[PDB]
């Protein structure tokens, strides 16, 4: 959960130099982001998620 004592940190992305393209090339491009865990990752204390709910 969003918690101050156990806050994780900050990921950020910056231009190191810049994106350079020649002529007759799209000047705007897209990057896609992916995340995953490493082999040292682990969880515990199984609980109920807040991403699914039911009505009535």
């Amino acid at each position: 959960i969003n918690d101050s004592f156990t806050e994780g940190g900050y990921i950020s992305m910056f231009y190191q130099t810049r994106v350079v393209v020649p002529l007759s090339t799209p000047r705007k491009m897209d990057i896609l982001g992916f995340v995953s865990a490493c082999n040292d990752f682990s969880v515990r204390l199984l609980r109920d998620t807040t991403h699914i709910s039911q009505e009535a």
Binding site: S24, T25, P26, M29, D30, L32
Partner: protein, 277 residues
């Protein structure tokens, strides 16, 4: 230490890389800009083993007659394309002797080699996610649950397209009874960004021209009815939209070539003629 003793009979009661050539039959595929090839779940397609054979009658294995590459209709990738889907073996039901064996037998089983081809210049942009989804169930377009009819659920080699937004079919007199696959929901109420849990490959136009997926036969049964059940679903989504030199209106073809592998059929009868759309 702790001691455990079972007090019952039934155990249920117990406590808990780039250059590649693929030859199948009389068909051959050469690729020079490939991003390797993925074997779904690391399992190569295989024939049913005697230890897992449910049907008793002798199977028929057409081998090269049906285990060969068939090329589907090419689709066009534009800036406005939302994605396409096909169902296997449904996409191959009208493809040579494979479809004949599919419709002459009650039970069929096959893995696949899916080869997606999309070539573009070095001045093009765009990425395609190509996903092999077992049991690719798609959401319908009506307030009635599970109301999609057989004809629309099995479009054939043309497949279907994803939609930008969900539209509800309110025509009570003549309901469409068609799918409404939303691209960002992956057509099944799940975020498309998580679709990468499925076997997949990305065609990034700056890196590769093609994707290859070796799908083993995946099912809760060793062999099933190919006319009733689609083992796999191939979903192609534009992850990065197509772009080119600011000219606009650019469109590049995407071609799909599927080879069934290790085909086994059981229960020969008169041919099945499914109702058409």
């Amino acid at each position: 230490n702790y001691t455990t003793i079972n007090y019952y009979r039934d155990s249920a009661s117990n406590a808990a890389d780039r250059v590649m050539q693929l030859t199948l039959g009389n068909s051959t595929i050469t690729t020079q800009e490939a991003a390797n090839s993925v074997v779904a779940y690391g399992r190569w397609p295989e024939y049913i083993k005697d230890s897992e054979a449910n049907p008793v009658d002798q199977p028929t294995e057409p081998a090269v007659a049906a285990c060969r590459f068939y090329t589907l209709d090419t689709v066009t990738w534009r800036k406005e394309s939302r994605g396409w889907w096909w169902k296997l073996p449904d996409a191959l039901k009208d493809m040579g002797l494979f479809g004949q064996n599919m419709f002459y037998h009650y039970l069929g089983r096959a893995g696949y080699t899916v080869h997606v081809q999309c070539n573009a210049s070095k001045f093009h942009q765009g990425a395609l996610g190509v996903f092999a989804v077992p049991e690719m169930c798609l959401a319908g377009d009506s307030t009635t649950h599970m109301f999609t009819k057989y004809e629309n659920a099995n479009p054939g080699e043309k497949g279907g397209e994803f939609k930008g937004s969900f539209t509800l079919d309110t025509n009570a007199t003549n309901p469409a009874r068609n799918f409404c696959p939303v691209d960002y929901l992956f057509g099944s109420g799940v975020l498309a960004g998580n679709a990468f849990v499925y076997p997949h490959q990305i065609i990034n136009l700056r890196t590769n021209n093609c994707a290859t997926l070796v799908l083993p036969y995946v099912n809760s049964l060793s062999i099933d009815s190919m006319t009733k059940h689609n083992n796999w679903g191939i979903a192609i989504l534009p992850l990065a939209p197509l772009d080119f030199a600011t000219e606009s209106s650019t469109e590049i073809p995407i071609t799909l070539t599927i080879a069934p592998m290790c085909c086994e059929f059981n229960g020969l009868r008169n041919i099945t003629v499914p109702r058409t759309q």
